[PDB]
Write an enzyme that holds these catalytic residues in place. Structure first.
Site, PDB file in Angstrom:
ATOM      1  N   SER A 134       3.377   2.150  -2.705  1.00  0.00           N
ATOM      2  CA  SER A 134       3.598   0.726  -2.514  1.00  0.00           C
ATOM      3  C   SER A 134       5.091   0.443  -2.451  1.00  0.00           C
ATOM      4  CB  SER A 134       2.956  -0.083  -3.642  1.00  0.00           C
ATOM      5  OG  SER A 134       3.805  -0.146  -4.775  1.00  0.00           O
ATOM      6  N   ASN A 200      -1.871  -7.231   1.636  1.00  0.00           N
ATOM      7  CA  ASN A 200      -3.087  -7.478   0.865  1.00  0.00           C
ATOM      8  C   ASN A 200      -3.875  -8.697   1.333  1.00  0.00           C
ATOM      9  OD1 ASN A 200      -2.771  -5.246  -0.776  1.00  0.00           O
ATOM     10  ND2 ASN A 200      -1.680  -6.370  -2.381  1.00  0.00           N
ATOM     11  N   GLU A 248      -1.256  14.246  18.606  1.00  0.00           N
ATOM     12  CA  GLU A 248      -1.506  13.165  19.556  1.00  0.00           C
ATOM     13  C   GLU A 248      -1.610  11.820  18.865  1.00  0.00           C
ATOM     14  OE1 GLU A 248      -0.872  14.917  21.820  1.00  0.00           O
ATOM     15  OE2 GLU A 248      -2.095  16.733  21.913  1.00  0.00           O
TER      16      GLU A 248
HETATM   17  N1  LIG Z   1      -3.837  -2.061  -2.016  1.00  0.00           N
HETATM   18  C1  LIG Z   1      -3.542  -2.032  -3.311  1.00  0.00           C
HETATM   19  N2  LIG Z   1      -2.270  -2.365  -3.726  1.00  0.00           N
HETATM   20  C2  LIG Z   1      -1.957  -2.341  -5.040  1.00  0.00           C
HETATM   21  C3  LIG Z   1      -2.904  -1.983  -5.982  1.00  0.00           C
HETATM   22  N3  LIG Z   1      -2.322  -2.045  -7.197  1.00  0.00           N
HETATM   23  C4  LIG Z   1      -1.036  -2.431  -7.040  1.00  0.00           C
HETATM   24  N4  LIG Z   1      -0.797  -2.623  -5.708  1.00  0.00           N
HETATM   25  C5  LIG Z   1       0.466  -3.037  -5.073  1.00  0.00           C
HETATM   26  O1  LIG Z   1       1.575  -2.444  -5.720  1.00  0.00           O
HETATM   27  C6  LIG Z   1       2.658  -3.349  -5.735  1.00  0.00           C
HETATM   28  C7  LIG Z   1       3.572  -3.110  -6.930  1.00  0.00           C
HETATM   29  O2  LIG Z   1       3.658  -1.738  -7.242  1.00  0.00           O
HETATM   30  P1  LIG Z   1       2.780  -1.151  -8.455  1.00  0.00           P
HETATM   31  O3  LIG Z   1       1.331  -1.063  -8.053  1.00  0.00           O
HETATM   32  O4  LIG Z   1       2.922  -2.043  -9.662  1.00  0.00           O
HETATM   33  O5  LIG Z   1       3.326   0.336  -8.741  1.00  0.00           O
HETATM   34  P2  LIG Z   1       4.720   0.902  -8.173  1.00  0.00           P
HETATM   35  O6  LIG Z   1       4.873   0.623  -6.699  1.00  0.00           O
HETATM   36  O7  LIG Z   1       4.783   2.383  -8.447  1.00  0.00           O
HETATM   37  O8  LIG Z   1       5.863   0.175  -9.034  1.00  0.00           O
HETATM   38  P3  LIG Z   1       5.763   0.187 -10.634  1.00  0.00           P
HETATM   39  O9  LIG Z   1       4.854  -0.937 -11.044  1.00  0.00           O
HETATM   40  O10 LIG Z   1       7.135  -0.014 -11.225  1.00  0.00           O
HETATM   41  O11 LIG Z   1       5.170   1.486 -11.110  1.00  0.00           O
HETATM   42  C8  LIG Z   1       2.031  -4.731  -5.774  1.00  0.00           C
HETATM   43  O12 LIG Z   1       2.767  -5.635  -4.985  1.00  0.00           O
HETATM   44  C9  LIG Z   1       0.646  -4.542  -5.192  1.00  0.00           C
HETATM   45  O13 LIG Z   1       0.574  -5.144  -3.924  1.00  0.00           O
HETATM   46  C10 LIG Z   1      -4.187  -1.647  -5.573  1.00  0.00           C
HETATM   47  O14 LIG Z   1      -5.037  -1.326  -6.398  1.00  0.00           O
HETATM   48  N5  LIG Z   1      -4.503  -1.673  -4.233  1.00  0.00           N
END
Ligand SMILES: Nc1nc2c(ncn2[C@@H]2O[C@H](COP(=O)(O)OP(=O)(O)OP(=O)(O)O)[C@@H](O)[C@H]2O)c(=O)[nH]1
Ligand SMILES: Nc1nc2c(ncn2[C@@H]2O[C@H](COP(=O)(O)OP(=O)(O)OP(=O)(O)O)[C@@H](O)[C@H]2O)c(=O)[nH]1
Ligand SMILES: Nc1nc2c(ncn2[C@@H]2O[C@H](COP(=O)(O)OP(=O)(O)O)[C@@H](O)[C@H]2O)c(=O)[nH]1
Ligand SMILES: Nc1nc2c(ncn2[C@@H]2O[C@H](COP(=O)(O)OP(=O)(O)O)[C@@H](O)[C@H]2O)c(=O)[nH]1
Ligand SMILES: [Mg+2]
Ligand SMILES: [Mg+2]
EC number: 3.6.5.-
Lengths: 433, 430, 49, 58, 42, 432, 430
Positions: A134, A200, A248
């Site tokens: 993310s 999302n 591809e």
């Molecule tokens: N699609 C999806 N996105 C998620 C999920 N959980 C968290 N996110 C996304 O992750 C973003 C933030 O990052 P985190 O999930 O908290 O984890 P990180 O990117 O490693 O950053 P940290 O929290 O510091 O560990 C949020 O804006 C969410 O959009 C999930 O279960 N599914």
């Protein structure tokens, strides 16, 4: 003898990978313990034989906060994985890009690349890498960027596929996501062959409209993502009339080296109620695959021309019906392509029908379409994130905590000018000759 | 791994700590004897966050108790769950404080702090991976207001990278239980503003009002108030000890909450809070949770947020609910109260979800907020300070122990500054 | 509330049995008639002493 | 004296059993289709439909 | 049976929350082949 | 290979749709669940689910969910696709402004999406059907908006407007002249052909022929459904002289402006017990042109006839048809306009009409459904014009229309449009 | 869906609601404990219009009780069906208004109305899609006549688009319980004329006449009158909650009943009304129902409806029947009483139908007619007001709480203007 290495870093990456591996193990028949149920050799893409009996997934889990790692190690998948490849840190970077890229990630990328080298040594016909993280998290963005820059010099020409989740315009969880996002896009603009758009709110609207779910949780989102990934990667492990490998993808979706950001779509997404009454034909399903609401990202394709579209049909789809459907799409007027692209369609066909998890929400359908599109309209997300970044950076809010980590002041400026270069490149490409 | 130590000093801080430890022990299913009789395996996965293991299977809190009088110590020792603390961690003097900030922070504190500093550094070395410190104190007294900030500075010079929070009880004129609040309060906050990482302010008047009107208790008591604040402070580290969909530890809260280095004063709140009768007719839903938590009624301080604009808000939900419903509720409330939120920071609301609800409740939310509202309290205390200082009343006591009026002048100047550059951002426009 | 609703539902699920057989002189005469019609043959069977 | 309001107009006549109260006319006319065996005799059909209409009215 | 949110009378009475919809009409049992088959050329 | 989609808008539209669809499912043998128990004509109105049931090609639009969830809880829940029963939020409450500028635009887009993803399935669109009662707010506004959108979305595709016009003296609304005149102005140039279906004439028919002193809206809808089935049976059943929907508007429409026709049906026969008779073709077609037998309260004897098209179903013989036509044209009570030497269109279908069990009509081996364009239709327009003028004389009720996004001039435009229409009707019937 | 929130104030409104909720709960099968015990499924799909869901499955009314004397509240709570109400909805003063419109509208009403505003906004936000507001009160009191009208004014200020209706028990001179009635009645009607979207007047004199004549009961009581008004007030929202041939909600009635924006006062009636010792015979067919409808001495107002010309009429039938007899009978009434109906609005009767009859009836009807007859009541009220005002009797208390003769003179001028403009439509010809 075809294999791909998958890396899950960050909370979002780990949670998506959980569902992804559930889907793969169910699809290939392997029980959670890993043992073969009471050969075809179609698991070589994602699993490696232990020599006698069970199998090991080709994935590496990485994160600095061990909550999700402990959950995985205490879950039903304790026996599946390699107890040494599930690397967990000690303290989380706390949404700080500098903390993850300069402070704590430096003594973890070493063991991460060691594990990558160990896996690659066993790999023989290695096609490439998948990265899942993310961007709205400091640790995720920073360690992803560090790992990708390391891999770019360790391996070089091998393909990388980036499944990154950009923040939505209105709906988001943190307050400092855009800073991390702009830094990470600065880092990854020139290191990955592709990137996908997976905000999302798009999937939220998807599940509220088609699946008509009222308060779905992250599990459904991750399941949909896993469906997309499996549809994309089934061509390397199943026989098809139109075999397509990862090579591809950037061959047909990257007209110029800079332009490598696409957005995805999947169909059909129907519960048992409404699919009992509807045709599920190829023409209608591909027509629905292009409509403005089934894309995986919040973008308006009517605001920009198309560059290149590649879709995979999975099931029993017939190429003749595919060609007729593509002709109908061409005769459709609301969709227009760039002038210098007479044909931009890349169709693929696979005989293996889609698979559904028991206890899930999807219905069993014998035709499916996974669509990946690169179009000129993608510049809007960059514009909105840039505007938001300017809004916060006008009075230098939250800057001093990055600065105190060792961070210099100027990377914000150079990331800003790089994003300006990217948007002007998109605009210049979008013009007619 | 991922642990925080606790230090309590003074009467009010000691009571806060005792009730907090009782609440945490009940939450984690630990009897006063230190044996475990919980049910869920997940109840013990991170017991090391607040406790240490001893021979025979017993658990001990990592808390330190300090003051200049033994009355509080032997009062809390004979109380319930009073045997959890290791007796060697009790440090107490015998001279008393006299509610004199100078006498506490300069005459006896310098000689007494050696043992407490030694024991706290011993605990810090012993712990696996320290993240930060937490201190409970009151600003209106002598002993607490002095040695709190003293220990704050002393911890800070050798831990500049670790985080630290202070649950500080502020004095208010409606409920005034002493005559020397302005002096010691401004003296302490002078160093809190420059050395503290986070400070959550609590007001007795607000506690009385909430327990009178929302709670509808006939006879509220200090025990009840201490339990309320203990639950509110325990809600902060929900996902730090339990799994959750969107984890957010104390450092994450810090990075999302602090826009400028010197703006680290917060007001907290808890929900749901229902009276004896209305809970029968009530239901539990995320919309009413959000409404109750965003009511200025639910705030723990007399400052009224309707008189200012929020800088940053945060909500720790706990229980099993989906992320979006919460998140678009935040979106709708931000759109509806857009004029009450700062305009040049879009999406200034933090949302976090933990999957382990409190015992007996299906779901609960803890709210934290940083807004321009707190300037009223600083202006009020500064007005009281200048009123008491114009005639130099009560000043000769301080000045008789090596004190002089100059640092009082810089303290009041710094308070006036803080107020000025805290109101400055309120009218700032993009 | 839940237990009261269970009790009310389980009681409401039971009602439709009428099966009218009011029987005082009807059944007394029925017994008499069947007794006569049956025991006439058993009177005309006895082995004489 | 009887306390409070204590109404006794009793607008409803009460003690009648209208078990066909909540029967929607739309549904009961549009979807009954009862009996009506495939008999070609006009008299039989007429008797059956008259009885059906009587039931619908009552 | 028809008390509040347990059984099926109509959608308003089902009033679902949380994860999904309770099935309404009859639905095929578990794993029906939805939509047309194809590829008969004989 | 031939498909037609019906659109229902308004409460009256939904009620008449219920009756027509139960009639079609009975006629085709589809049991209300959809599954066929124990050909290919059903493709005209239904689509195969692939294995088992069938789905009607209709969409229901209404802003008040009462009728919608009544349908969804009725015995016909099993039939329709759950997502084609589109329900809005606020009923227009007989206010045209609400249904046409205020809240109709948030639903018309989704309705057009439904239309497109229904039409793309089919290939042989002859045209569409629309059902609506003009004496209401939401039905009229949404119908006008839908027609205006479809006129440019599709263009040359045919439209059939089965509107429910206000009755001459009975009425359930009090402000219905305003929405009626506005919808007439909208529909003058946005639909191909429209029919007159006022309630009073059908009331008279059911009291006279059925000999029933207890009719309600159900009988109204059943008669209308019978008319629709008689109209559409030629598309799905073999006949000695087939006729298409496109064979209607090229024959009944002399000039583009004049496309409002009026219908009749015969023989509508009660089932008391009697032998009745064999219902000869000559006598049934004599009854068909009886002025009081007309489905609309328009007296043909007060005007001239432009065109007449009738369809016979059963075992009707063309020689009998032609002898009957000879007798009608011999009769002097009805006369044609001079520039129409012939004005008759005839259709023949082998399929006898299907009797609804528990209904009012009885089984008969002959039937005729007739639709005619006649000059005397100007009287209803004139009386509605006086109706609206009496109201607009002192601007009664105008203020809530004005305050809901409506400007004030358009009433004058509608008035002058009706003036032009009545002048055209007067001048077309003049002798050369 | 498209629910309406109930707000009642004053003793009159409180007693009205006490029987409204009784009748509604009886109709929908709800016990005093909020427990559903109905038999048909049709009783629950639209139950959300008047009720909200609570944990455990209970339904609770969305009603707001407001007053100045706690006596009404604890009298109505102790009675049956009093446990349905949520105590948080009770709002009451402690000093009273003393039938002083000035004191209730300027001094104490403004001070107290903040909390009830908060609760009504909470309810309006909680409801998914607001349809309108409905109020019950009397102009013969002080607290109601003031704080009601003020509340309508302000809620219309916040919600200028949503419809709203109010029921007014207007004072009568022959049986009058206050000498202040002209003053506060004139003030409140002046406030209400420009604010209330719909107003429906009720006369206790007409109620007494009805219960004496057609019920033939010797001893009526306020409970009996409240039951009659509650039956009429339940009848109006029939098709909004239940299906029928032609559903016609409050907005439909408003569109079809008001010719000009200033003419929104209505007189109503109910049918059939049979004697208590009614013999068992026949059934209430359409002819006698519609005759008992238009019996002018059946109306619930003292105004004689044949004294003027009906601007429009409306009928809500309840029960299963055809519309042919409906419209033919309405035309028959039109033709036989063409003198009583003004000619430039021909066919001026609303007909609406609901399929579910009232409990214990096979057929019933509510009539709501807007006729030129109400001008006499306004004329007599104005005459009494000016007779009392010419020498400034009882005026000094009204002047002692902040207002002066300007409000009275503008109110009476507006009243005279209303009466005159209401009368020109009577003699206007086409
Ligand atoms: N699609 C999806 N996105 C998620 C999920 N959980 C968290 N996110 C996304 O992750 C973003 C933030 O990052 P985190 O999930 O908290 O984890 P990180 O990117 O490693 O950053 P940290 O929290 O510091 O560990 C949020 O804006 C969410 O959009 C999930 O279960 N599914
Ligand atoms: N033929 C027929 N017409 C009906 C029926 N029900 C209502 N109508 C007509 O509908 C008109 C009034 O409109 P509504 O029934 O309320 O439906 P609408 O046209 O959508 O108007 P709205 O109230 O805004 O929904 C009346 O003038 C009737 O002529 C019916 O069952 N059969
Ligand atoms: N909640 C709570 N507050 C307390 C308690 N004891 C004292 N206080 C608060 O502490 C304030 C006085 O502080 P003080 O005792 O002089 O602080 P000290 O000098 O550090 O002991 C009063 O205003 C009280 O509100 C307690 O047991 N519970
Ligand atoms: N119909 C009816 N009228 C009532 C009731 N209670 C009071 N009234 C009328 O209201 C008038 C007095 O109103 P009041 O109690 O002063 O109103 P308040 O000041 O708002 O409480 C009397 O003339 C009564 O006729 C009731 O329960 N039913
Ligand atoms: Mg994290
Ligand atoms: Mg309607």
């Amino acid at each position: 003898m075809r294999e791909v290495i998958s890396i899950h870093v960050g909370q979002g990456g780990i949670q998506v990978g959980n569902a992804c591996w559930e889907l793969f193990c169910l699809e290939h028949g392997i029980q959670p313990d890993g043992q073969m149920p009471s050969g075809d050799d179609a698991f070589n893409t994602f699993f490696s034989e232990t020599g006698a009996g069970k199998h090991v997934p080709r994935a590496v889990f990485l994160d600095l906060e061990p909550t999700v790692i402990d959950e995985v190690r205490t879950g039903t998948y304790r026996q599946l994985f390699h107890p040494e490849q599930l690397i967990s840190g000690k303290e989380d970077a706390a949404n700080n890009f500098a903390r993850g890229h300069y402070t704590i990630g430096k003594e973890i990328v070493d063991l991460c690349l060691d594990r990558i080298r160990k896996l690659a040594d066993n790999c023989t016909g290695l096609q490439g890498f998948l990265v899942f993280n993310s961007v709205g998290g400091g640790t995720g963005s920073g360690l992803g960027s560090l790992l990708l820059e390391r891999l770019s010099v360790d391996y070089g020409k091998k393909s990388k596929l980036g499944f990154t989740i950009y923040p939505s315009p209105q709906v988001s969880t943190a307050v400092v996501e855009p800073y991390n996002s702009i830094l990470s896009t600065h880092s990854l603009l020139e290191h990955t062959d592709v990137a996908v758009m997976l905000d999302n709110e798009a999937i939220y609207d998807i599940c509220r409209r088609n699946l008509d779910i009222e308060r779905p949780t992250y599990t459904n989102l991750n399941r949909l993502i896993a469906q997309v990934i499996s549809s994309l990667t089934a061509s390397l492990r199943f026989d098809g009339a139109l075999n397509v490998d990862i090579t591809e993808f950037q061959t047909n979706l990257v007209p110029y080296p800079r332009i490598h950001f696409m957005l995805s779509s999947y169909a059909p997404i129907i519960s048992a109620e409404k699919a009992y009454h509807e045709q599920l034909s190829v023409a209608e399903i591909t027509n629905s695959a292009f409509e403005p609401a089934n894309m995986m990202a919040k973008c308006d394709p009517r605001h920009g021309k198309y560059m290149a579209c590649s879709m995979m049909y999975r099931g029993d789809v017939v190429p003749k019906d595919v060609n007729a459907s593509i002709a109908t799409i061409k005769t459709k007027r609301t969709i227009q392509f760039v002038d210098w692209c007479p044909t931009g369609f890349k169709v693929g066909i696979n005989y293996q029908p889609p698979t559904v998890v028991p206890g899930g929400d999807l219905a069993k359908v014998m035709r499916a379409v996974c669509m990946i599109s690169n179009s000129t309209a993608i510049a809007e997300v960059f514009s909105r994130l840039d505007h938001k970044f300017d809004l916060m950076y006008a009075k230098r809010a939250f800057v001093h905590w990055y600065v105190g980590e060792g961070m210099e002041e100027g990377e914000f400026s150079e990331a800003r000018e790089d994003l300006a270069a990217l948007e002007k490149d998109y605009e210049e490409v979008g013009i007619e000759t | 791994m991922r642990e925080i130590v606790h230090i309590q000093g003074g009467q009010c801080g000691n009571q806060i700590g005792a009730k907090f430890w009782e609440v945490i022990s009940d939450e984690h299913g630990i009897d006063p004897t230190g044996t475990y009789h919980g049910d869920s395996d997940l109840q013990l996965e991170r017991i090391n966050v607040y406790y240490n293991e001893a021979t025979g299977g017993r658990y001990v809190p990592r808390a330190i108790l300090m003051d200049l009088e033994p009355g509080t110590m032997d009062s809390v020792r004979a109380g319930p769950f009073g045997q959890l603390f290791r007796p060697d961690n009790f440090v107490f003097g015998q001279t008393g404080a006299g509610n004199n900030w100078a006498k506490g922070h300069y005459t006896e504190g310098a000689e007494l702090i050696d043992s407490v500093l030694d024991v706290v550094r011993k605990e810090a070395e012993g712990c696996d991976c320290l993240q930060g410190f937490q201190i409970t104190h009151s600003l209106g007294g002598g002993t607490g207001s002095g040695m709190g900030t003293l220990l704050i500075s002393k911890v800070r010079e050798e831990y500049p990278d670790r985080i630290m929070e202070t649950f500080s009880v502020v004095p208010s004129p409606k409920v005034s239980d002493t005559v020397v609040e302005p002096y010691n309060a401004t003296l302490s906050v002078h160093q809190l503003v420059e050395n503290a990482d986070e400070c959550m302010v609590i007001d007795n008047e607000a506690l009385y009002d909430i327990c009178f009107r929302t709670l509808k208790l006939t006879t509220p008591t200090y025990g009840d108030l201490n339990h309320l604040v203990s639950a509110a402070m325990s809600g902060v580290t929900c996902c730090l000890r339990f799994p959750g969909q969107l984890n957010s530890d104390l450092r994450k809260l810090a990075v999302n909450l602090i826009p400028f280095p010197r703006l680290h004063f917060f007001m907290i709140g808890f929900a749901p809070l229902t009276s004896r009768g209305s809970q029968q007719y009530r239901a539990l839903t995320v919309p009413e949770l959000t409404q109750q938590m965003f009511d200025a009624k639910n705030m723990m301080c007399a400052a009224d947020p309707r008189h200012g604009r929020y800088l940053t808000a945060s909500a720790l939900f706990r229980g099993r609910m989906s992320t979006k419903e919460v998140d678009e509720q935040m979106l709708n409330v931000q759109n509806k109260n857009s004029s009450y939120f700062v305009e040049w920071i879009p999406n200034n609301i933090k949302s976090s979800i933990c999957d382990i609800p409190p015992k007996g409740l299906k779901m609960a939310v803890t709210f934290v907020g940083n807004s321009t509202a707190i300037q009223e309290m600083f202006k009020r205390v500064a007005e009281q300070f200048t009123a008491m200082f114009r005639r130099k009343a009560f000043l000769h006591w301080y000045t008789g122990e090596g004190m002089d009026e100059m640092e009082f002048t810089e303290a009041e100047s710094n308070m006036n500054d803080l107020v000025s550059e805290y109101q400055q951002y309120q009218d700032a426009t993009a | 509330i839940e237990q009261d609703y269970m009790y009310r539902s389980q009681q409401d699920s039971f009602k439709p049995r009428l099966l009218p057989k009011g029987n005082k002189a009807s059944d007394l005469s029925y017994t008499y008639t069947k007794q006569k019609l049956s025991q006439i043959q058993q009177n005309n069977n006895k082995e004489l002493f | 004296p009887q306390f409070s309001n204590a109404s006794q107009i009793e607008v409803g006549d009460r003690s009648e059993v209208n078990h066909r109260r909540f029967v929607s006319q739309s549904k009961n006319v549009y979807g009954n289709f009862g009996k009506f065996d495939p008999v070609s005799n006009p008299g039989i059909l007429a008797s059956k439909t008259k009885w059906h209409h009587h039931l619908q009215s009552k | 049976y028809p008390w509040n949110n347990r059984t099926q009378n109509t959608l308003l009475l089902k009033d679902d929350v949380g994860r999904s919809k309770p099935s309404a009409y009859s639905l095929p049992p578990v794993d029906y082949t939805y939509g047309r088959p194809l590829e008969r050329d004989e």
